[PDB]
Protein backbone atom coordinates (compact mmCIF):
# COMPACT_ATOMS: atom_id res chain seq x y z
CA UNK A 1 0.00 0.00 0.00
CA UNK A 2 1.46 3.48 -0.89
CA UNK A 3 1.23 6.11 2.19
CA UNK A 4 2.48 9.53 2.24
CA UNK A 5 2.92 10.80 5.96
CA UNK A 6 3.17 14.23 6.37
CA UNK A 7 5.07 16.37 9.03
CA UNK A 8 6.27 19.83 9.89
CA UNK A 9 2.97 21.39 10.47
CA UNK A 10 1.46 24.00 12.87
CA UNK A 11 1.64 27.78 13.79
CA UNK A 12 4.12 30.63 12.67
CA UNK A 13 4.12 33.95 13.40
CA UNK A 14 3.54 36.48 10.40
CA UNK A 15 7.13 36.70 8.56
CA UNK A 16 8.20 33.11 10.00
CA UNK A 17 9.55 30.29 7.99
CA UNK A 18 8.51 26.47 8.43
CA UNK A 19 9.47 23.39 6.50
CA UNK A 20 7.29 20.39 5.57
CA UNK A 21 8.15 16.80 4.92
CA UNK A 22 5.93 13.91 3.31
CA UNK A 23 7.67 10.54 3.78
CA UNK A 24 6.67 8.16 0.20
CA UNK A 25 6.32 4.32 1.56
CA UNK A 26 5.37 1.34 -0.81
CA UNK A 27 5.51 3.41 -4.04
CA UNK A 28 4.82 0.52 -6.76
CA UNK A 29 6.57 2.32 -9.96
CA UNK A 30 10.12 3.54 -11.21
CA UNK A 31 9.07 7.06 -11.76
CA UNK A 32 7.17 9.40 -10.10
CA UNK A 33 5.76 13.50 -9.82
CA UNK A 34 5.63 14.81 -6.13
CA UNK A 35 3.31 18.34 -5.46
CA UNK A 36 2.57 19.93 -2.52
CA UNK A 37 -1.15 21.62 -2.29
CA UNK A 38 -2.71 23.57 -0.66
CA UNK A 39 -6.67 24.05 0.53
CA UNK A 40 -7.00 28.35 1.99
CA UNK A 41 -10.26 28.88 3.94
CA UNK A 42 -13.09 29.03 1.96
CA UNK A 43 -10.92 28.47 -1.59
CA UNK A 44 -10.13 26.16 -4.40
CA UNK A 45 -7.40 23.44 -3.71
CA UNK A 46 -4.53 24.86 -5.28
CA UNK A 47 -0.96 23.55 -6.47
CA UNK A 48 1.82 24.93 -4.90
CA UNK A 49 4.78 23.23 -6.22
CA UNK A 50 6.39 20.29 -8.03
CA UNK A 51 9.46 18.13 -8.30
CA UNK A 52 9.65 14.37 -10.07
CA UNK A 53 12.11 11.74 -10.02
CA UNK A 54 13.96 13.41 -12.69
CA UNK A 55 12.84 17.04 -12.97
CA UNK A 56 13.75 19.52 -10.25
CA UNK A 57 11.42 21.61 -8.17
CA UNK A 58 9.35 24.45 -9.48
CA UNK A 59 6.68 26.55 -7.70
CA UNK A 60 3.16 27.12 -9.17
CA UNK A 61 2.20 29.58 -6.94
CA UNK A 62 3.02 33.05 -7.50
CA UNK A 63 4.24 35.19 -4.42
CA UNK A 64 7.97 35.79 -4.32
CA UNK A 65 11.02 34.66 -5.13
CA UNK A 66 11.02 33.28 -2.70
CA UNK A 67 8.59 32.28 -0.24
CA UNK A 68 8.29 28.34 -2.04
CA UNK A 69 11.07 25.97 -2.14
CA UNK A 70 9.98 22.28 -2.70
CA UNK A 71 13.41 19.33 -2.67
CA UNK A 72 13.75 16.11 -2.03
CA UNK A 73 16.07 13.48 -0.95
CA UNK A 74 15.68 10.78 -2.79
CA UNK A 75 17.69 7.94 -0.57
CA UNK A 76 15.12 8.88 2.71
CA UNK A 77 12.20 8.65 0.07
CA UNK A 78 11.05 12.02 1.46
CA UNK A 79 9.84 15.63 -0.57
CA UNK A 80 9.87 18.73 1.49
CA UNK A 81 8.20 22.15 1.02
CA UNK A 82 10.39 24.99 2.47
CA UNK A 83 8.53 28.50 3.70
CA UNK A 84 9.36 31.96 4.59
CA UNK A 85 8.66 35.44 5.09
CA UNK A 86 5.19 33.48 5.60
CA UNK A 87 1.92 35.56 5.54
CA UNK A 88 -1.44 35.57 7.13
CA UNK A 89 -2.43 34.31 3.15
CA UNK A 90 -0.37 30.78 3.61
CA UNK A 91 -2.56 29.91 6.01
CA UNK A 92 -4.39 26.52 4.48
CA UNK A 93 -4.40 22.59 4.51
CA UNK A 94 -0.91 21.58 3.00
CA UNK A 95 -0.89 18.52 1.37
CA UNK A 96 1.53 16.25 -0.65
CA UNK A 97 0.21 14.29 -3.62
CA UNK A 98 1.82 11.67 -5.29
CA UNK A 99 1.35 10.45 -9.17
CA UNK A 100 3.63 7.93 -11.53
CA UNK A 101 3.46 10.24 -14.43
CA UNK A 102 7.37 12.16 -13.93
CA UNK A 103 6.48 15.63 -15.82
CA UNK A 104 4.85 18.71 -13.89
CA UNK A 105 1.57 18.91 -13.23
CA UNK A 106 -0.44 21.70 -11.45
CA UNK A 107 -3.93 19.60 -11.82
CA UNK A 108 -4.99 17.90 -8.57
CA UNK A 109 -6.84 15.24 -10.31
CA UNK A 110 -3.57 14.03 -11.73
CA UNK A 111 -2.93 12.92 -8.75
CA UNK A 112 -4.26 9.23 -7.30
CA UNK A 113 -2.05 9.31 -3.88
CA UNK A 114 -2.38 12.01 -1.63
CA UNK A 115 -0.87 12.67 2.58
CA UNK A 116 -3.96 13.43 5.15
CA UNK A 117 -3.23 17.30 5.34
CA UNK A 118 -1.18 19.26 7.46
CA UNK A 119 -2.71 22.31 9.01
CA UNK A 120 -0.72 25.83 8.42
CA UNK A 121 -1.62 28.63 10.64
CA UNK A 122 0.30 32.21 9.87
CA UNK A 123 -0.68 34.57 12.86
CA UNK A 124 -0.75 38.06 12.24
CA UNK A 125 1.11 40.80 13.15
CA UNK A 126 0.05 44.14 15.07
CA UNK A 127 -1.36 46.81 13.83
Known amino acids: QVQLQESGGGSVQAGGSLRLSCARS????????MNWFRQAPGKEREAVAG????????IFAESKAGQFTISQDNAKNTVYLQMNNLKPEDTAIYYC?????????????????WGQGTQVTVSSAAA
Open 97 to 113: AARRDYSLSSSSDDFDY
Open 26 to 33: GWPYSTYS
Open 51 to 58: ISSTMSGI
